Design an enzyme around this catalytic site. Structure first.
Site, PDB file in Angstrom:
ATOM      1  N   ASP A 171      -8.916  37.057 -14.013  1.00 30.60           N
ATOM      2  CA  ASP A 171      -9.908  37.667 -14.894  1.00 30.60           C
ATOM      3  C   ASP A 171     -11.135  36.793 -15.102  1.00 30.60           C
ATOM      4  OD1 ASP A 171      -8.967  35.673 -16.617  1.00 30.60           O
ATOM      5  OD2 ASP A 171      -8.066  37.060 -18.061  1.00 30.60           O
ATOM      6  N   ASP A 220       2.275  35.222 -14.911  1.00 28.71           N
ATOM      7  CA  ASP A 220       1.137  35.959 -14.363  1.00 28.71           C
ATOM      8  C   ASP A 220       0.479  35.025 -13.347  1.00 28.71           C
ATOM      9  OD1 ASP A 220      -0.555  38.121 -14.036  1.00 28.71           O
ATOM     10  OD2 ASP A 220      -1.329  38.087 -16.094  1.00 28.71           O
TER      11      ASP A 220
HETATM   12  O1  LIG Z   1      -0.564  42.720 -17.814  1.00 27.98           O
HETATM   13  C1  LIG Z   1      -0.205  41.584 -17.061  1.00 27.98           C
HETATM   14  C2  LIG Z   1      -1.011  41.598 -15.796  1.00 27.98           C
HETATM   15  O2  LIG Z   1      -0.840  42.930 -15.186  1.00 27.98           O
HETATM   16  C3  LIG Z   1      -1.534  43.003 -13.863  1.00 27.98           C
HETATM   17  O3  LIG Z   1      -1.368  44.264 -13.351  1.00 27.98           O
HETATM   18  C4  LIG Z   1       0.001  44.564 -13.055  1.00 27.98           C
HETATM   19  C5  LIG Z   1       0.391  45.778 -13.864  1.00 27.98           C
HETATM   20  O4  LIG Z   1       0.452  45.390 -15.270  1.00 27.98           O
HETATM   21  C6  LIG Z   1       1.685  46.384 -13.418  1.00 27.98           C
HETATM   22  O5  LIG Z   1       1.957  47.624 -14.098  1.00 27.98           O
HETATM   23  C7  LIG Z   1       1.648  46.677 -11.927  1.00 27.98           C
HETATM   24  O6  LIG Z   1       2.864  47.146 -11.524  1.00 27.98           O
HETATM   25  O7  LIG Z   1       1.359  45.417 -11.174  1.00 27.98           O
HETATM   26  C8  LIG Z   1       0.068  44.844 -11.553  1.00 27.98           C
HETATM   27  C9  LIG Z   1      -0.148  43.604 -10.731  1.00 27.98           C
HETATM   28  O8  LIG Z   1       0.767  42.603 -11.085  1.00 27.98           O
HETATM   29  C10 LIG Z   1      -3.021  42.698 -14.004  1.00 27.98           C
HETATM   30  O9  LIG Z   1      -3.598  42.561 -12.690  1.00 27.98           O
HETATM   31  C11 LIG Z   1      -3.256  41.434 -14.765  1.00 27.98           C
HETATM   32  O10 LIG Z   1      -4.679  41.271 -15.025  1.00 27.98           O
HETATM   33  C12 LIG Z   1      -2.505  41.389 -16.066  1.00 27.98           C
HETATM   34  O11 LIG Z   1      -2.771  40.136 -16.713  1.00 27.98           O
END
Ligand SMILES: OC[C@H]1O[C@@H](O[C@H]2[C@H](O)[C@@H](O)[C@H](O)O[C@@H]2CO)[C@H](O)[C@@H](O)[C@@H]1O
Length: 213
Positions: A12, A122
């Site tokens: 981010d 993360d």
């Molecule tokens: O919220 C934590 C993290 O999530 C990231 O996206 C995830 C998403 O929450 C999940 O539903 C999906 O299955 O996978 C994605 C990728 O891991 C997001 O990119 C991050 O910014 C966030 O901090």
């Protein structure tokens, strides 16, 4: 700390939460960067995600040492821990699912993640998704990709800022575009490869075992 956990991916561009003073017993907090990846020794610069000018350094990116081992960074939220116990700690992750099952990623915690399962990591990778706070929009006009999970094709790395492309491509190369693989983890002494990038080493670093590649 040790145990099992779930992984996600993110980038981010925000100032990492372990870049603030007074968060953990360390020599100094994680170096944040200006918009052009110059390190900021001044830990008081405000986060670019809060109207300021401090961002995640591009060198907080993962890279492969060989086909079995990578080094990198993560935002952590651990059972029984606090920011004071994980900021700038290192952990050896052994993946237990996905195409990367059995591979090792040693990370330094540079920030605090969200609650997701028992021990959320993360994992930093440019183009893995800004999530809730789009700091990259302010830093340099934005990265491509979905808000959550980021880009979906390797070619989308081609338009990234130069310093963010290697970490972007690592996701598709060594990491095999793995989708939220599970892992076991063990806290370890930080490899100098990681603390030389962040400048942040915990006073209790030697309380934990040496990592052996
Ligand atoms: O919220 C934590 C993290 O999530 C990231 O996206 C995830 C998403 O929450 C999940 O539903 C999906 O299955 O996978 C994605 C990728 O891991 C997001 O990119 C991050 O910014 C966030 O901090």
């Amino acid at each position: 700390a040790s145990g099992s956990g779930q992984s996600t991916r993110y980038w981010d561009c925000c100032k990492p939460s372990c870049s603030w003073s007074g968060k953990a017993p360390v020599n100094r907090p994680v170096l944040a960067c200006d918009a052009n990846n110059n390190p900021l020794s001044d830990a008081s610069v405000k986060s670019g995600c809060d109207g300021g000018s401090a961002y995640t350094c591009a060198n907080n990116s993962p890279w492969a040492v060989n086909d079995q081992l990578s080094y990198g960074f993560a935002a952590t939220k651990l059972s029984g821990g606090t920011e004071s116990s994980w900021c700038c700690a290192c952990y050896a992750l052994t993946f237990t699912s996905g195409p990367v099952a059995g591979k090792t990623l040693v990370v330094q915690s540079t920030s605090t993640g969200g609650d997701l399962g028992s021990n959320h990591f993360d994992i930093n990778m440019p183009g893995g998704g800004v999530g809730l706070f789009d700091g990259c929009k302010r830093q340099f006009g934005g990265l491509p990709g979905a808000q959550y999970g980021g880009i979906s094709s390797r070619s989308q790395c081609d338009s990234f800022p130069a310093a963010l492309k290697p970490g972007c491509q690592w996701r598709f190369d060594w990491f095999q575009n793995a989708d939220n693989p599970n892992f076991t983890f063990k806290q370890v002494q930080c490899p100098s490869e990681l603390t030389s990038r962040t400048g942040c080493k915990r006073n209790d670093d030697s309380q934990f075992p040496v990592f052996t590649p």
